[PDB]
């Protein structure tokens, strides 16, 4: 009953905080590690209990260089972007998919919109306005998930604790095959 | 944008009515065929419309049924809540067959006729053979022994859970 998850995506898109809120239940306000230490989550699906190992990744000198070594013996990949950063969504299609297809190909991919709480925030809307950009819409997000062939598209906010459980329960359902 | 689903399970467990209610929108009371005509449903997932081909099966049917398995993406193994025997056959008959012919595919275990779980006449009939309607726990346990992708319960008669069954199968079929 054991499975492995790897989470990847642009720096600062919210990967580590998402794992921490799911695992520990509280958003980390001051200290955030670069990568969440490996942890085994208990996830209940259809009455069954599976242990899900959470493998966080980064792009910081050596963490970037070592990241391909996380994919072996994986069962599900989370590709993340931040709703307040359309640039991080462009890299989902540009950089991250190319990596997963190079290293994994046959694993299910969940596409995860992180920081969903920033979607309607005026300060972000004004900043993105300057380049004629907007926070990512569910439409655009679901559209990129299809383009990259993902298993599911999900949105979440670590900060408000919205949608976090659904990400990991879904990812676990995909991992069980 | 196309996927194929095959539905299997004991005769009269509710396979054909489930497809008709999902496809056509009305529970079939006048005419019910042994197997529904092959039909392609539109199912929306994550904003995407996918065409889901529905392949009904029966038991000159116990022998021709394997010709439905090629090119499937998802299998529904069905039983009826008012028939624990049909749940017993999931493992004794149906799981070995789908793995013999398909092996690669996600499997959903689907409790059908869920509207009968609390029907008094049903409960008394099963009492006479020391049985009771299948519980959620009893179904989930078989879904576990079967390594199934999902366990779902539904009632075609009343429509509870029907949409969710086919939306889940489509999500599974995209693997
Ligand atoms: N508004 C908002 N900010 C977030 C959320 N999750 C993370 N952040 C912030 O994004 C920054 C980077 O987050 P982090 O988890 O370290 O991103 P990572 O590099 O992918 O691990 C930090 O300042 C977090 O406080 C969220 O759900 N909402
Ligand atoms: N109570 C109840 N009866 C049902 C339901 N679905 C089918 N039936 C009945 O089960 C019998 C056989 O149904 P059918 O769809 O032909 O089962 P199949 O042999 O698996 O194709 C018929 O009398 C149906 O009306 C349901 O959801 N609830
Ligand atoms: Mg990080
Ligand atoms: Mg029939």
Q: For residue A32, how many C-alpha atoms fall within 13 Å in the half-sphere facing its CB?
A: 20
B39, B56 in Cβ contact below 8 A? no
Q: Between β-strands B48-55 and B2-9, what pairing exists: parallel, antiparallel or unpaired? A: parallel
- Region of A147 (left: φ > 0; alpha: ψ -120 to 50; beta: rest) is alpha
Contact yes or no for A81/A15 (Cβ under 8 A): no
Q: CA nearest A11: which of A87, A69, A109, A75?
A: A87
The answer to whether B149 contacts A173, with C-beta atoms less than 8 Å apart, is yes
Query: Residue B88's CB: how many other CB atoms inside 10 A?
Result: 13
Residues B135/B126, Cβ–Cβ less than 8 Å: no
- Please indicate whether, in this complex, the C-beta atoms of A47 and B175 are within 8 angstroms of each other: no
A173 contacts B140? CB cut-off 8 A = no
Query: CA A15 → CA A82, A91, B5, distances in Å?
Result: 9, 15, 36
Of A32, A102, A39, A40, the C-alpha closest to A67 is A102
**Residues B102, B108, B109, CA angle at the centre, nearest 5°?**
115
Q: For residue A157, report the distance from its CA to the centre of ligand 3, in Å.
A: 15
Ligand 2 geometric centre to CA of B157 (Å): 8
| Helix runs in chain A, H state only | 15-24, 62-66, 86-91, 97-103, 122-129, 138-147, 164-175
From the list A47, A138, A177, which residue is nearest B106 (CB)?
Answer: A177
Of B8, B15, B17, best ligand 2 pocket probe by most atoms within 8 Å of the beta carbon: B17
d(CA A127, CA A129): 5
Choosing from A11, A13, A14 the residue with most ligand 1 atoms within 8 A of its CB, the one to mutate for a pocket test is A14
Q: Are A119 and A138 in contact (CB under 8 A)?
A: no
Q: What would the DSSP string read from start to end of B61-117?
A: -TTTGGGG-TT-SEEEEEEETT-HHHHHHIIIIIHHHHHHHTSSS-EEEEEE-GGGT
Q: How far is the CA of A95 from the centre of ligand 1 (A)?
A: 20
The first and second tokens of residue B55, run together, are 């392949």
- The coordinates were experimentally obtained by X-ray
Length of chain A: 177
Q: Can you point out the beta strands (E) in A23-134? A: 39-45, 48-56, 76-82, 109-114
B167 and B5 in contact (C-beta within 8 Å)?
A: no
Q: How far is CA B81 from CA B28, B87, B123, in A?
A: 19, 8, 11
CA–CA dist A175, B33 (Å, integer) = 38
Nearest to B35 by CA among B52, B53, B54, B57: B57
Alpha helices in A3-154 (DSSP H): 15-24, 62-66, 86-91, 97-103, 122-129, 138-147
Q: Which atom of ligand 1 is nearest to the CA of A159?
A: 27
CB B76 within 8 A of CB B7: yes
In terms of C-beta density within 10 A (0-12 exposed, 13-18 middle, 19 or more buried), how is residue A113 classed? buried
User: Longest Cα pair distance anywhere in chain A, in angstroms?
Assistant: 50
Is the CA virtual torsion A106, A107, A113, A114 positive or negative? negative
In the three-class reduction of DSSP (H, G, I as helix; E, B as strand; rest coil), residue A92 is classed as helix
Alpha carbons A1 and A102: distance in angstroms, whole number: 28
DSSP code for A157: B
Q: How far apart are CA B79 and CA B124, in angstroms?
A: 19
Residue list for the binding site of B for GTP: 9-16, 56-59, 112-115
Extract the tokens encoding A116: 């969903």
Query: Which ligand 1 atom sits nearest the alpha carbon of residue A35?
Result: 21
Question: How far is CA A62 from each of CA A79, A100, A126, rounded to the nearest angstrom?
Answer: 20, 19, 35
* Token pair of B11 as six digits: 């005769």
* Contact status, residue B149 vs residue A173, Cβ threshold 8 Å: yes
Residues from chain B contacting residue A177 (CB–CB below 8 Å): 106, 149, 175
Is A20 in contact with A28 (CB distance < 8 Å)?
A: yes
Q: Do B144 and A47 touch (CB under 8 A)?
A: yes
A146 to B175: CB separation less than 8 angstroms, yes or no: no
Is residue A158 in contact with ligand 1, taking CB distance under 6 Å?
yes
- Would you tell me how many other CB atoms lie within 10 Å of the CB of residue B157? 18
A2 three-state secondary structure: strand
- From the list A90, A78, A72, A80, the residue with the least C-alpha distance to A115 is A80
- Return the ligand number nearest the Cα of B161: 2
Q: How far apart are the first and last CA of chain A?
A: 11
The distance of B139 to chain A (nearest Cα, Å) reads 10
- Per the CB < 8 A criterion, the answer to whether A70 and A63 are in contact is no
* Spatial CB neighbours of A143, under 8 Å, sequence gap ≥ 6: B47
- Rounded to whole angstroms, the Cα distance separating A112 from A82 reads 8
Q: Resolution reached, in Å? A: 2.8
């Amino acid at each position: 009953l054991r499975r492995k998850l790897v989470i990847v995506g642009d720096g600062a898109c919210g990967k580590t905080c998402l794992l921490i809120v799911f695992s520990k239940g509280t958003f980390p306000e001051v200290y955030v590690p670069t990568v969440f230490e490996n942890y085994v989550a208990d996830v209940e699906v259809d009455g069954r209990h599976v242990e899900l190992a959470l493998w966080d990744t980064a792009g910081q000198e050596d963490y970037d260089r070592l990241r391909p070594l996380s994919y072996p013996d994986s069962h599900v990949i989370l590709i993340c972007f931040a709703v307040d950063s359309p640039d991080s969504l462009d890299n989902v299609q540009e950089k991250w998919i190319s990596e997963v297809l190079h290293f994994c190909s046959s694993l299910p991919i969940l596409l995860v919109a992180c920081k969903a709480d920033l979607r309607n925030d005026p300060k972000i809307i004004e900043e993105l306005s300057k380049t004629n950009q907007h926070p990512v819409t569910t439409e655009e997000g679901q559209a990129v998930a299809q383009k990259i062939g993902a298993y599911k598209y999900l949105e979440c906010s670590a900060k408000t604790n919205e949608g976090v459980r659904e990400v990991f329960e879904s990812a676990t359902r995909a991992a069980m095959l």
